[PDB]
Amino acid sequence: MISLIAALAVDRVIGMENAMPWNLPADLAWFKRNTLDKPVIMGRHTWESIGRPLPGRKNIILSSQPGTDDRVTWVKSVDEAIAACGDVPEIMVIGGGRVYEQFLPKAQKLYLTHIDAEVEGDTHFPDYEPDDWESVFSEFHDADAQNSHSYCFEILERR
Numbered sequence: 001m002i003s004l005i006a007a008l009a010v011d012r013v014i015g016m017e018n019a020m021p022w023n024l025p026a027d028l029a030w031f032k033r034n035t036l037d038k039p040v041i042m043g044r045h046t047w048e049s050i051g052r053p054l055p056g057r058k059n060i061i062l063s064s065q066p067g068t069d070d071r072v073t074w075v076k077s078v079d080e081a082i083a084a085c086g087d088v089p090e091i092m093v094i095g096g097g098r099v100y101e102q103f104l105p106k107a108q109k110l111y112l113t114h115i116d117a118e119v120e121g122d123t124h125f126p127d128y129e130p131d132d133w134e135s136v137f138s139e140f141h142d143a144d145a146q147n148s149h150s151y152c153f154e155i156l157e158r159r
């Protein structure tokens with residue numbers, strides 16, 4: 001079971017110059033809660049951005065080139081990334097944009113944080129077909145002292 005997990009602002013913008021330009025710690029707790037104790041697959045650009053392997057998660061990095069860090073598992077293809085996970089109840093694909101595009105047809109579930117933020121981006125989440133996905137969880141939250149925007153946690157399962 002391959003899942004994609006991502007945070008989308010207005011117009012599916014997910015990043016700008018290798019950062020996620022919003023202040024929303026509620027998404028960080030949601031991300032941690034939903035990925036802990038599960039293998040995480042990421043692209044090289046996302047890996048370089050975090051700088052350290054995510055604890056309590058096998059970290060699988062996609063790159064066409066040989067790996068440069070033995071603390072993580074390096075892979076050269078989508079199918080080799082999935083194989084590297086072994087038999088686990090759930091695999092989490094955590095970004096970035098190019099990795100989401102390739103894994104989307106292979107995913108069975110999407111965990112989306114819809115952020116009410118106007119952001120200029122250079123990275124977008126893929127344009128998934130609404131008819132192919134069913135929302136099975138949808139929780140809206142207003143902004144507060146810690147979270148600068150209103151947001152919604154959504155779980156969609158492939159029909």
Ligand SMILES: NC(=O)C1=CN([C@@H]2O[C@H](COP(=O)(O)OP(=O)(O)OC[C@H]3O[C@@H](n4cnc5c(N)ncnc54)[C@H](OP(=O)(O)O)[C@@H]3O)[C@@H](O)[C@H]2O)C=CC1
Nearest residue numbers: 006007015018019043044045046063064095096097098099
């Ligand atoms: N909002 C959110 O939810 C998230 C947003 N982001 C954002 O996304 C952006 C980064 O995304 P993006 O620029 O698309 O880059 P990615 O992080 O998706 O990484 C791209 C690199 O991954 C490697 N790769 C991808 N596919 C394959 C493949 N099939 N086989 C072998 N290697 C592959 C390549 O590395 P190589 O060139 O070495 O071959 C490629 O250059 C940043 O702005 C980041 O902040 C990231 C995570 C979450």
Ligand SMILES: C[C@H]1CCc2nc(N)nc(N)c2C1
Nearest residue numbers: 005006007027031094095113
């Ligand atoms: C590096 C982490 C930071 C926060 C985050 N949040 C969600 N909802 N999905 C993700 N893939 C990520 C990537």
Ligand SMILES: [Ca+2]
Nearest residue numbers: 010011012013
């Ligand atoms: Ca746009």
Ligand SMILES: [Ca+2]
Nearest residue numbers: 016017021120
């Ligand atoms: Ca600028």
Ligand SMILES: [Ca+2]
Nearest residue numbers: 018019020021
């Ligand atoms: Ca950032």
Ligand SMILES: [Ca+2]
Nearest residue numbers: 018019020049
């Ligand atoms: Ca990042």
Ligand SMILES: [Ca+2]
Nearest residue numbers: 049050051052
């Ligand atoms: Ca950091």
Ligand SMILES: [Ca+2]
Nearest residue numbers: 052053054071
């Ligand atoms: Ca470490």
Ligand SMILES: [Ca+2]
Nearest residue numbers: 050052053054
């Ligand atoms: Ca980390």
Ligand SMILES: [Ca+2]
Nearest residue numbers: 044063064065
């Ligand atoms: Ca490279």
Ligand SMILES: [Ca+2]
Nearest residue numbers: 082083085086
């Ligand atoms: Ca597997």
Ligand SMILES: [Ca+2]
Nearest residue numbers: 098100101102
């Ligand atoms: Ca693509």
Ligand SMILES: [Ca+2]
Nearest residue numbers: 010115116117
């Ligand atoms: Ca909005």
Ligand SMILES: [Ca+2]
Nearest residue numbers: 116117149150
């Ligand atoms: Ca806002």
Ligand SMILES: [Ca+2]
Nearest residue numbers: 097122123124
């Ligand atoms: Ca782009």
Ligand SMILES: [Ca+2]
Nearest residue numbers: 126127128129
């Ligand atoms: Ca869409």
